[PDB]
Every structure is written in structure tokens, then in C-alpha cells.
Amino acid sequence: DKMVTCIAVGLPLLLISLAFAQEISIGTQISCFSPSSFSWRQAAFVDSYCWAAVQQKNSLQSESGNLPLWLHKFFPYILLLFAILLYLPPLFWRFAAAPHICSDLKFIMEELDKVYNRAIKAAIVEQYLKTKKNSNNLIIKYISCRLLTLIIILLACIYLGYYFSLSSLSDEFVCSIKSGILRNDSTVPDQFQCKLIAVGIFQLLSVINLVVYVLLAPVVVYTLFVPFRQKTDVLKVYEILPTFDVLHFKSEGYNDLSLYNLFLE
Amino acid sequence: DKMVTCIAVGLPLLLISLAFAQEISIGTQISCFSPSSFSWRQAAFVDSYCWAAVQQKNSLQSESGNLPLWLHKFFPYILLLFAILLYLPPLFWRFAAAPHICSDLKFIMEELDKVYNRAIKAAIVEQYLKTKKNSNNLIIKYISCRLLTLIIILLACIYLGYYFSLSSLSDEFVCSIKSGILRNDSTVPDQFQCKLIAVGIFQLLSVINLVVYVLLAPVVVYTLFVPFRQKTDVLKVYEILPTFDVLHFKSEGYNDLSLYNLFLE
Amino acid sequence: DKMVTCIAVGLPLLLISLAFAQEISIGTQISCFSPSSFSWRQAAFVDSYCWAAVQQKNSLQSESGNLPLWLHKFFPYILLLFAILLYLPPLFWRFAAAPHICSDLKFIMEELDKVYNRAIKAAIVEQYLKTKKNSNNLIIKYISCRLLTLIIILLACIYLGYYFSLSSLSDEFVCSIKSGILRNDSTVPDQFQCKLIAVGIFQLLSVINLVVYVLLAPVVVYTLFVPFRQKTDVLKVYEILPTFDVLHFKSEGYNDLSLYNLFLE
Amino acid sequence: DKMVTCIAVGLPLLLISLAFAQEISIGTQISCFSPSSFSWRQAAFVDSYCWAAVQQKNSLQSESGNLPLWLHKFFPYILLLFAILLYLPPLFWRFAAAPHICSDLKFIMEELDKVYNRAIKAAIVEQYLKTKKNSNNLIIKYISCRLLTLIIILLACIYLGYYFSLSSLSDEFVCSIKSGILRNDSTVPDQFQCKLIAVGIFQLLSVINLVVYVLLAPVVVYTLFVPFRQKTDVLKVYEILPTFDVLHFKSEGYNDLSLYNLFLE
Amino acid sequence: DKMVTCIAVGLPLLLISLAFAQEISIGTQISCFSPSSFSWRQAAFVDSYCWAAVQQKNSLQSESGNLPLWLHKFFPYILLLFAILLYLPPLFWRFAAAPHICSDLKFIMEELDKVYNRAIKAAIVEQYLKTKKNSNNLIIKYISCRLLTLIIILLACIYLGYYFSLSSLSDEFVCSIKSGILRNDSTVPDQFQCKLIAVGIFQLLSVINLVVYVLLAPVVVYTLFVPFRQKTDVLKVYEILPTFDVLHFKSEGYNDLSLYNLFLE
Amino acid sequence: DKMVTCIAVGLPLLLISLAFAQEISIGTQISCFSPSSFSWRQAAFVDSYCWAAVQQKNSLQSESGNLPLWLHKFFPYILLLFAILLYLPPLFWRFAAAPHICSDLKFIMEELDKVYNRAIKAAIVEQYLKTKKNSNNLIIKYISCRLLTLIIILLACIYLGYYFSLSSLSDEFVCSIKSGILRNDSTVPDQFQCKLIAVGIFQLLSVINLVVYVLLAPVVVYTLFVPFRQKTDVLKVYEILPTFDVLHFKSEGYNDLSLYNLFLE
Amino acid sequence: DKMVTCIAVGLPLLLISLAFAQEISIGTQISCFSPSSFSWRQAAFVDSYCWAAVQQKNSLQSESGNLPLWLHKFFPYILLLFAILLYLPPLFWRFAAAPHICSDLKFIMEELDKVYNRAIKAAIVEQYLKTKKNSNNLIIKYISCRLLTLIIILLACIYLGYYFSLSSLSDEFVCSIKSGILRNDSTVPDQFQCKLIAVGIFQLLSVINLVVYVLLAPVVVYTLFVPFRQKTDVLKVYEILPTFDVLHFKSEGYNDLSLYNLFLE
């Protein structure tokens, strides 16, 4: 499991730590330029207004190119989703395949202690391969949780890949106070080309989540092709190669890996 | 239980984490526009006044359409209720059906070890189906706690569904200081069309709670129709299908899932 | 105990969590309107003065109707009392009836294992009903701690019920600085009709504590009338129905709930 | 011990929680009225000066009536003392009588298991009343720690009782900056009738500590008069009634409280 | 040990809690009076300068009487030392006498179980008084750690006793900015008679540490004179009275304190 | 393992603690010089703008020499990577070689207890050197995780070595507000030669990470040359010297290191 | 070990607590004197500039005497190093001598239980002194970690000893804004003789670390001269005196320290 669970534990934890590293250096999020201390609380009001009138005006006030993109106000808010959607199919395996594979773990531990007392009497296990010869289409439910994550990883390497072509000059947006003008239509300056503060490290942290998950998307497929390279097809390996690894994974003893020493000597 | 308790544990925890994610980015809640630094503490007083004169004036000062809606000042305050009302029927099951099903768990574990020593002597359990043949109308009390949650989930997908048709322009409300005018009737500007800061992420977080619970409301009903598809009606299954799952849920051994291996070989 | 202790544990914890939810959104408590930045520290002094001259002036400066009500400055301060006064008779039961009922729990566990070895020899308990036939007026001390809570719950549904008829316009109070005038009698504006900030959510959170405890006051009485409906009066049930529940509450075995299976088959 | 240790554990913890509840709502402590923003840091300096020139000027600058009372700057500072002075004689009992009463607890547990094996042989304890017949004047050291607390409780109901007659108008004190005048004797306004902010809740929290400890001072004496009402005087009960309770307090068994069942049947 | 370790554990913990109680109410430490808002950052600079030019100017700028006293800037800083210097000789006992007295504790526990099996055979210990008859001058190393603390306690009751005669008017000190004048020699006002904020509670908390340690200095000597009153001198008691207490301190049994019951009956 | 794991545990923890020590003294990060209080919120806006227009302008506004270096805004952000890239090959060893070496640890513990019972019978192990004589090319996978870290350590001593030649005057950068000018092209001063605050301790903390890792890069190679100095080449030692250390590393007994005592006597 | 490990545990912990005590009272670190509120953000910029232009200007702007001393900006930053460099040779002992001395601890515990069963049979150990008679030059590696710390302690008493002769007037430094002048060469005042705030307690806390480590440097050497005073030289004691202490250090029994009682009687 380590070849899969190492990734499935470390990399969502990598993403939540990489979100929390940006959460260290928040401070504020936008800094609006009020007309050079014509007030102080009107400055905070303009800041709040433009921080909430990012998305509701669907007309052309930003004009930097395809402004319906919500000005990426949501990278912790999206990154938490993209962490938990990778975290969850491990929980689905743990809540749909873990007790059955735990009973099968007891079965294969009974197989190895039956091998041990067979060697004791030598100083039946051959029927257990018949117990794992059968149809057993339920193991493909277990392999789905790996391949379901690989869909979300693939679109993660697409969604962040949109962000770099996006972020040329998708920060310096103009913002009006138009209902604020519609208070009076009288005195307030009409628009304030404010600036988001986080676009500099939203970009150069979306390098790291992208290029790591680029360096990992073929790696999960490599676990799924050892079933192709081990003498039987993917519709036959389900009780062998998901069992051949786990037999040596949990526990062995003084006869398991001393078979081949005694097989060679 | 995992097909139900997975949802019943994760999804209220999902909702409290999704409330705490908004609790990260609070800052302030309203930003009132005082007349361009004619004071600083009058600005904070106008902010406080309008943040508490949201609901008490039942007259038409907002006029954006059906202003008796309390301007949704309560989404953590409502979301905590909608989390605990889903959390509580699990506690009602745990405080009304858990010791009786624990004694029944000891009974079915005695059934499986009686099967085990029956196989030992083969190297009485048939009366236990008569023990679960009887009337036992108390198991419908256990199935009520699932279906009680599905009522609250259904109205959760209605209450949030009101919010999106609500939130067209139900933020930019005018607010007067009228008792504040009734201090003097003299000098203060008469109304301040302030703006709530949280309407931008109250909307686009009520997507996520809605569409997930939309994607889950038929799923709980699927657990309640396996009783329809298993040879006896819902007024007969109560001691079979709430027992057929739990027999394999808690613990098995070297004879339970090796029955069918020995039944086939 | 679960039919009582579920309420007695959850609902004071409900009230302390419901107080802490208001403790999340404190910020400040009053916002006094100083004369439009004629100072900044005089504004904070007027705020502090009026926040402490709420109650000490017993004369008519508020005039909104029966101003000796302390302007409800104490809802966490009162709600903590109304939580601990419901928490404490469980502690009084635990410090006056728990070791005696623990010894009686050992006695009834001896009764059930005597039933078990009686069935073993069948493959004296009849004297124990004589041990619980006697006068035993001390069990009414145990039933007092339930009914003492129901007094405090009843006045809780009265005290909060005063608050809604109270809170029509019992916020906008006028406040003078009269000893502050008696510093000089010269220059300071004479009164400031300030405004408490918490009256909007003190009201609509006293809905929830009221209507839940309205939905719970008859429920505790239902536990006290099963003694009426079980063949003997309230001055006879004390060693039967406080013992009939606890025999099945703590632990049973393979003979207790298999009596009726063997009684029917 | 529960009739004493319940009070001795809960009520000092009550007082430290009741101090921490005021520690929640500190904010600031005094708010001095500088001359209407003639500075900002001179305002904080006047605030600090008057907050430290409360007590050092023993002359008549407050004139509200017997101003040597330190203007009660110390209610957490005094309340911590009045909590730990009630907490400490339990520690004195635990460090002067607990190992000896633990050995006596082993002795009386040997007495009850000797009763148990006496009933086993029936299917010497009479000498142990001679072991507790003797002079044993050291048990009066144990009863002193109860009565030492009752002295501190009695003066606690006197010291707080001074505070309510004190606090008529012992807040609005005049404060000069006289060494501050003695800097220059030139320009600063000569006195500032500042105001402590905490006098409103120092009063109406000294209700609760008073009236609870009023409701508890006769209750501790009731434990000391059961020795008067149990057939022997206070200079004879010391090895009976401090032992009659503890025999049933720690542990009993299937023969102790089944004596009277077998004594009656 | 309780007659010593009760003090040695509680009273340094008393002093660190009594320092932390002042650490609750820090706020700031000095408040310098800049010339009535002639700046704001010059006010903070004057505050910082005078808070660091307390001690470095050894000339007469304070003139309140013997100004080389560092204006007591160090009461948490000194009180931590006076707590740890009392804490440390317990650690010196624990690191120089605890394993040897633990082996002696095993020896005296062997003495009492040898007494127990001597009573069993009655139904050699007399040589052990010869084992503790010898010279053993190393026990005076153990008694030094008590008397070393009593030196530090005695000077603690002297050092705080200096502070009350000190603190008449050793707060209102004049402070110049002379190198600050030596920037320009031009415009800044030449001296600022600032005021430390903590002198009011540094005084009336040095009551409590003084009068408690006054009430404790003869008490430690009382433990050292029970060796004088127990039939042998201080150069003979070292293996008797440091052993007579510990024999009953750790553990006894059904024969130790039932000796005198059987000795009397 | 201690000769490697001591470094591999302490030194990434050294780097994260050395990053957190700079995280103690953050305060702010840049301090832009607005035109001498021509506003306050324009000052914060200029600060935010220049803190995010560090990298996006790739033209010559800094001109201090090769300004595409991102002005080292990322030393915690880079140092976390350089800590976890050294932390991770220990995890790769733990997830790829730890269970196999744990089974081999059980094998060599069986070898030493076989030696022990061989000495018991003296009052087969010679075949185990044949079990570790074989080809076993998988141990070179274990030695890769040491040498993979030494690549990252080597470039760490290069990347920090760039920083000292970098940081001559790569702090005082000019920053314009050009889109801010492109708001109006009217009134705002055109550029602000701001200054990063952290360049003084980014330099003199990159001493410590450099010179320690300079003092450690040859040390890891010394572990890899004991295989050269122990009678067999690196393609033969893999089952001897990775086993000769671990035999004495985990546990020995009364015969292992008493071999040579009995071999010499 | 207590004579060494007491120091090696307490005194680096003393230094980290003594650094954290200064970390309590940080506030700010420098307070620059801008020209008397000619701005507010220019004041913070001058403060930041001079706090980072301490060290980079190597020319004569401070002129207080040998200004290349970095104005001691690093006392927590240096004190952490001087704590961990004393902490680390205990870890080097624990990772280079602790398992070997643990096996030797098992060997000497086997020696004492062999003495115990030798006394049992009396109701071979003489060969073990031959086992510790041999060459064993590896124990000098263990004594190096004590003497390596004594080098760092000695230079600690030199480095702090530089600081007191340093700190006469090495605080009041002049600071220009010269690149800040090189923005304009026009209007800003040219230099600001600012002042570090921490020089007053950096001095009088470097008393305590100095004079304690002065009082400890000969004490570690005293442990290294008991090998000189115990009948064999330093090149012979290595298996006796590092073993004579540890035999009584860990555990003894009823025969070890009762040897001399039975040797004398």
C-alpha cells in the first residue's frame, strides 16, 4: 500500500500545508487607493465594496480579458476542495474495502501460519489458491478508488494550468462605487483601479502544486500495470497481485523469507 | 453502518469545517459609509447602529424586495443549527438503540462462535432464526433516525435554494439613523446606504452545501430499499437485514468467509 | 438514565455553546455617539461612562418604560448561571446517590449472575424481591434532583419570556454625563442617546433557548409518570422502576434477553 | 467526604471561574477625561497617572467618604487570595491526615473482608472496636481544617458586605496631576474627575459570591453536629463517626448492605 | 517530607503564580508625557528613551533620594530568580540524596516485611538498628539543602523589606533626552518627568510575598529541632529521625499501626 | 543508523527551527516611503503595490544588477522546500526498505539467539553467512536515499552561496506605481525607492545554514567509504556492513560483547 | 551522571528560559526619532531603514568606537546557538556511547545479580574485573563530550565578557537615510540619531549568564579529577570510575549496600 498510500497521505497533506504557508502571510487581501486621504473610513468602505463587488457586476469594468473569472478570490477555498477530493477515496476504501481485506488479511496470516506448522510437521495450503481462483468482481471496486483520484489529479493539472495563462494582467482591475454613486450621484470619485495583493504568490505557488502533480500522475498508473506484467490479465490478477504484496507487507517470519535461502542452499 | 455513518459523521463535520473556513476570513461584517471623514467615532457608531438596525425597523428602508429577511445575518448562526440537527439523530440512535443492538451483537457473536464449535464437533444455531422471526416493532424506531435526518436534509436543500433567488441585490440596503436624528433632528446626514461584506462568499459557499446535499438526498433512501429487494417486505426484514450486515460488519473468522470456499470446493 | 442524562448533559452544554457562539461575535458592546469627533478620547470616555452609568442612575434618563431592568447587560452572565443551576443536580445525584446505586448495581449484577448459575444448575434469586420490597424512602431523594431541575427550567421559560415583551425599544437609551457635567457645568454636550450593539442577537438567540426548553419541560415529566403506569403507585415503585431500567441499562448476557426467546419457543 | 469535599472543590472553583468571567470582559479599567483631545498621548499619560495615583495620595482629593479604601483596584487580586485560602486546608488535610486515614482505610477494609470470611466460615472483628475505643486526640487536627475554612468563609461574607455600603458613589473620584503640575506649574488643567469602568460589575458580582456563601456557612456546621446527635459527645465520636461514613464511602460488597436484608428476612 | 516539601513545592509555585498575576495586568510599563501632542512618534521615542535611560545615566536627574536603585525595573526579573533559588535545593536533594534514600527506603521496607514474616513465624530485625548506629556524616549533606533555602528566604524578607522604605516617591523621576538634545541642541523640550505605571502594585504585592515568608521562616527551623527533642543530639539523630518519619511516610500495613493496638490490648 | 539518522533528523529540524526564529521577528516585510504623509491609506496602498510589483515588471526599474531574481521574497518559502527535500528520502527509506530490514532484523535476532542456545548446548549459525552471500542488488536502493540527499545538500551549499554575492545592494529598489499612474497620469509621485526590511537577517542567517552544511557534506560520504575499507568492494559489502552495524545497534546480550572477553581470557 | 547531566540539562534550559524572559518584554526593538511628526509612515520607514542599515554601512556613521560590531542585534539569535552548542554533546554521547553503555549496564546488572546468587549459594564475578582490565581506548571518546562543552562554556564567558566593555555608549548611534537622500537629495533631514531599546536589559541579563557560567566552569573539571585521585591514572580508570558510579547509580538491592553493614557487624 506504501507505493500508493505514501502519495495519498503525503500529497493532500502537502497541499494543506502549502495552503497554510500562504495562510501565514495573509495580512490583508486587497488595498484600494482612495483619493489620497480624503477620508479614512471611506477608504475602508471602498476597500470592502470593491472586495465584494468583484463578482456581482458582470459588466465590463475590469476589461483585462474575460473578467468572469471571479478574480481568483478562492485559492485556499478551492485548494481545500482539491485536497479533500483526493483525501476522500482513501476514506471510501477504508469504509468499503478495509474490513473485507482485514478478514482476507487474517486468512493469509492463517495461510502463512499453516505454512509454518506444515514445516513443523515436515521437520492444506494448496487449497487456498483455489479459494482465490474464483470470479470475485468486487476487487475492481477497490481499484476504482485509485483511478478516481487520478481523474481529480488530472484536472488539478489542468485547472492550475489555466491560471498561468490567466494571470498576465488579471490583477489591476478598475472598481467603481456605482450604487455608492447612486447614493448621491454627486461627489465621490467614480472608479478606483485597486489591486489584489495575493496575485504574486498565488502564481508562484501554483508552480509547486502543478509540477509536483505533473511528476506524480504517471506514477499512480505504474501501480496499475504490474497487473499487466505478471502473467495474467487485469481480469485475473485481482486475488493474486492485490494479495502478493500484502502477504509480505504486514508481517512475515523466520520461514517466509528464509524459503529462498533454503531453496538455494 | 458505514454506508450511513460515513455520511452522518463526515457531512456535519463538512458543514462545521465549511463554516469555520468562512470564520477564517471574517475581518469585519459591514462597512458603513460615513460622510467622508466627518468623524471617526461617528463612523463606528453609524456602523454599529446600522448593524443592529437591520431587523428592528420593519418599515421600508431597504426596498430591494421583501426586506423582512433579516438580511441573512445568521449563516454561521443557522449553519450550526443545520449541522447539529443532522448530528443529533445519530446521538438518539446511540442513546436509544446502541445498548440493545450491542446485546444483539453479543448474541450474533455467540451465533458465530456456536457455528465455529459446531464445525469443531463436525470435524443449536437453527433456533436463532426463530429468535429473530418474531414481531419486534421496535426496530422501526431505529430506522426513524435515518429518515428523520432526511427531512432536515430536504429542507436544507430548500432553505439554501431560497438564498440564491434572494441574493440578487439584497445587500445594498439604505440605513438611516432616525432615533439618531431624533436625538437632535438637526445636523447628521439622514441615511447611509451601507453594504454587507459577506454576501459574496455567503452565496458561493451556499453552492457547496446545496449541491453536495443534493448529491446525497437520494443516497440515504438507497439504504432503505435493500429491505424492499431482499425477498421480504419492510415489515418483515427488521431482524434480518439490520442483522445480515452487522454479522459481517464487526468481526468474522476463519470459518465465516471460508464457508463459500468450502461450499464451492 | 439516557432518557434523562441525555438532556442533562446535552442541554446545559447546548446553552454554554450557545453563549460561546455569541462570545464569538462580541467585538464591542456599546457604541456611544460623541459630538462628531470633537475628540477621540472623550468619545471613549463617554462610551465607558455610559457603559457603567447604565444601572447606577435610578432616575428617569431612559424613559422607554420601566428602565430599572439593568438594560440586560448580563446575558452571558445570567446564562452561565442558568446553565450551572441545571448542571448541578446531576452532580448532587452523583455525590449523594451514585455510590449507593453503584452498590445496588453490584447487587443486581449479582442477581443476574445468580440467575445465570441457576440456569447452569438447571441444565436464591426469589429473596431479592423481598430485599427491594421494603420501605426505602431515600429513593425519593434521588427523584428530587430531576424535579429540582424542572423548577429551574420552568422559570427559564419565564425569564426569557419576559425578554421579548421587554425588548420593543429598550435599547435606544439616553445617557448624560452629569458628574461629568459636575466637573465643570460648562462645555460638554449634556446627553448622548447611545445604543447597545447586542440587542439584535440577544433577542433572536433567546428564541432558541426558550423554544427548545419549551419543547423539553413536559418531556422530563414523562419519565416521572411511567411510575404511575406500572401497576404500583409512586410510593411503591421506588425499588422496582428505578431498578427495572438499570438492570437492562448497564449489562446483560446470553440468558437475559434470551429468556423471552426460550419463553416463547 | 462528599458533603464537605463537594463544597471545598466546587466553591473555590466557582470563585476562580467567577473571577475569570470578569476577566473575559476587562477591556480597560479606567477611562480618564483629558480636555477634549488637547492631545492623545497626554490622555494616555493622564490615564496612567491617575490609575497609579489612586492610593499614594493619602490627602483629600476624592472626598466621596473615607477615600483610604484603595478604590477597590484589587477584586481579582483579592478574590484569588480568598479562593486559595479556602483551597489550602483541603491540601493541609491531604498533607497531614491523608496517609494516616489511608492506612485506617486499609484497616477498615481489612475489617470488612474479615467480616466476609467470618460469614464464609459461618456458612476477630469484635476487637477492632477496642482499637478505635482509645484516646486519639489527633482526629481533632483533622476537624480543624473544616473549621478553619469556616472562619475565612465568615469574613468573606463580611468583607464583601462592606463593599455594598461602600459603593454608593465611590467611583467618580477627582484626580489631579500635581507632580505633573510640579513639572511646570504652567499650563495643564489641574484635575480630572475620571471614572473606573469596573464598579458596575464589581458590585453585582459581589452579590453572587456573598449570597452563595451566605447559603453555605451554616451548612458546614451541620456536618459537625451529627457528632452531637449520635449517642456520644464530640470528645468520643472521633473514631466512630469519621469512620462510620468512610466504611460505606469507599467500597462495600455483597454482604455489607445485604446485612439488613438478611437481618430483616 | 510533607512538612518540608509542601512548602518547597507550593511557595515557589506561589511566587511564580503571584508574578504571573502581575503579568496579567501589564499593558505598558511607563507612560511619558510628551509636550501635549507635539508629535506621536516623538512621544513613543521619548517613552522608549526614558525607559532605557533609567539606569545608564548615573548622574542626578531623578534626585528623589539615592537614584542608583535601577528604579526597580526587574520585579518579575528578580522574582523569577528568587523562585528558582528556592526551587533548586529540592533538585539538589533529588540529584544527590534521592537514590541513596531510595535504596534506604527499600532497606526499611525490607525491615517492615521482615517484621511481618517475624510475626508470621511468631503465629533478624534487631541487627538493623546496628546498621543505622554508625557514623554516617553524609546525612548532614541532606540537611544542608533545607538550611540553604532558609538563607535565601531570610534575604528575601530583607530585600523586599528594603522596597517599602524605598518606594515613598521613587517613581516620579525626571528624564531628559540629552543625547537627543545633543542631536541638535535646538528645539526639543529638555526634560520629561515621566512616571512608571507599576509602582502601585509592585508595592502592594511585595506585602504578600514578604508577610507569607515572614510567616514561614521560623517554621522550617521547627523541623530541625525535633532532632533536638528526641533523646539524642543532632550528631546522632541522622539515621533515626530522618528514618522514623519515612518508615510511616511511604507505606505501612496491617501490623505496623496495629502494633500499639495489640500492645495495648 | 545514528551516524546518518542523527544528521537526517536534527538538521532538517535545525532548518525549520532556524526558519521559525526568523518567523519570530517578522513584524512587516517592506516599508515604502510615501511622500511624507500625503496620506495614510495611499501609503499602505503603495506598500502593497510595491510588495506585489516586485516580480511582475520584468523591465529595468531596480537596475542594481540582474533584477530578475524576485528580490528573494521566498526564504521561508524556499527553506521549507529545502528542509522537506532532505526530510523525504528518510521517509522513502521508511516506506521502501524498513519492513524488509525489519524482517532481516528479526532474522539477525534469530541469529544471535541461535548463537545463545548454541552456547547453551556447548555448556546452524554458519549457514546464515551463506544466506547473506548472495547477489541482492536491492540494498543499493537503500544506499540511494543517502546519496540522493547529498545532491540536495550540495546544491543547498550552492544556492545560498549565490545569495552572498547577490546581496551587495539588492535591497534598495526603486518602485513606480505605473498602472497607478495609468489611473490618472496626473498627480501621484512617480516612483518610490522602497526598502525590504529582511535583507539584514536573510544574509546573516544564510551564513549558518551554509557553513553547517559545508561542515556536513563530506561527513555523509565517510559512511559510504567504510564499505571500501572493509575487505570487500561496494558490490559485495551490501549484506555485511549494512548488517554488521545493525547487529550491535538494536540489542545484544550477555554473550555478544562477552565473546571477546571470553575470547581473550 | 547527575553531577554532569544536572548541569547539562538545567543550564541550557536556563539559557533558553532566560532568552524567553527577554522575549516576554520585546514590544519593539528600535525607536527612531523622525522630525517631530512631519509624517507617520515616514517615521516607520525611517525606523525600518535604520533597523536594517545597522550593519550594511561599514563607514563611520556611529563613531562611538569600533562600530563594526553589528550593534548586538542578535542576542536571542546568538544565545540560541550558545544553548544548542551546549545541548548537542549530550546528544552526541546519547548517539555514540549510550547503547554501548546500556549493554555494559546490562553487564554490570548481571554482575550484581551474580553477586546475589553467589550469596544465595553461600547461604564467576572475579573474572569481570579482567573483562574491564583491558585497553579500551573508546571510553576517551565518551569523556570528550564533557570537555568539548567546557570549550564552549569558556568562550561563552569570554564573549559575554566582551559585551560589558562594549556597552558603554554603543547604543546612541546616528543613522542617515542616504539612499533615501539619493532618492531626491532635496528635502528629508539627513540623519537621525536613533536608539536601540534593548541595550538596558541586554547588559544586565548578560550578568546572569556570565556569573553563573563563571560559577560552573571549574565544577565540570572536578568530575575529571576524581580519576586522578583514585589510585590509577587517567589512562587506566576508564573502565573503573565510569563504572564505579553507574553501578550504584541505576539500581541496587538488599545485598549491595548491606555488604558494608555485614562487613562491619
Swiss-Prot record, chains A, B, C, D, E, F, G:
Q: Where in the cell is it found?
A: Cell membrane; Endoplasmic reticulum membrane
Tissue expression pattern: Widely expressed. Highest expression is observed in oocytes and brain. Detected at very low levels in sperm cells.
Q: Where are the transmembrane segments?
A: 7-27, 73-93, 147-167, 196-216
Positions of disulphide bridges: C32-C194, C50-C175
- Single GO MF annotation: scaffold protein binding
Catalytic activity as recorded in UniProt: chloride(in) = chloride(out); iodide(out) = iodide(in); ATP(in) = ATP(out); K(+)(in) = K(+)(out)
Specify the glycosylation sites in chain numbering. Answer: N184
Task: Describe the effect of W40A.
Answer: No effect on voltage-dependence. Altered anion selectivity with equal permeability for iodide and choride
This protein's record includes keyword ATP-binding: no
Phosphotyrosine modification sites? Y128
Topology in the lipid bilayer is annotated as: Multi-pass membrane protein
The highest taxon in the source lineage is Eukaryota
Describe PTMs of this protein: S-nitrosylation inhibits channel currents and ATP release. N-glycosylation plays a role in cell surface targeting. Glycosylation at its extracellular surface makes unlikely that two oligomers could dock to form an intercellular channel such as in gap junctions. Exists in three glycosylation states: non-glycosylated (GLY0), high-mannose glycosylated (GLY1), and fully mature glycosylated (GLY2).
GO CC terms for this protein? bleb; endoplasmic reticulum; endoplasmic reticulum membrane; gap junction; membrane; plasma membrane; protein-containing complex
Q: Identify the keywords attached in UniProt to this record, alphabetized.
A: Calcium, Calcium channel, Calcium transport, Cell membrane, Differentiation, Disease variant, Disulfide bond, Endoplasmic reticulum, Glycoprotein, Ion channel, Ion transport, Membrane, Oogenesis, Phosphoprotein, S-nitrosylation, Transmembrane, Transmembrane helix, Transport
Q: Which residues lie on this side of the membrane: Extracellular?
A: 28-72, 168-195
Cytoplasm as a keyword of this entry, yes or no, is no
The modified positions for S-nitrosocysteine read C6
Question: Where this protein primarily resides, as one coarse class?
Answer: membrane
**Effect of mutating I201V:** No change in glycosylation pattern
Q: Per the UniProt entry, what is one GO biological process?
A: response to ischemia
The protein's assembly and partners? Homoheptameric.
Family (UniProt)? Belongs to the pannexin family.
Q: Summarize the disease involvement recorded for this protein.
A: Oocyte/zygote/embryo maturation arrest 7: An autosomal dominant infertility disorder due to oocyte degeneration and death, which may occur before or after fertilization.
Primary role: Ion channel involved in a variety of physiological functions such as blood pressure regulation, apoptotic cell clearance and oogenesis. Forms anion-selective channels with relatively low conductance and an order of permeabilities: nitrate>iodide>chlroride>>aspartate=glutamate=gluconate. Can release ATP upon activation through phosphorylation or cleavage at C-terminus. May play a role as a Ca(2+)-leak channel to regulate ER Ca(2+) homeostasis.
Q: What is this protein called?
A: Pannexin-1
- Organism, by scientific name, is Homo sapiens (Human)
Gene from which this protein is expressed: PANX1
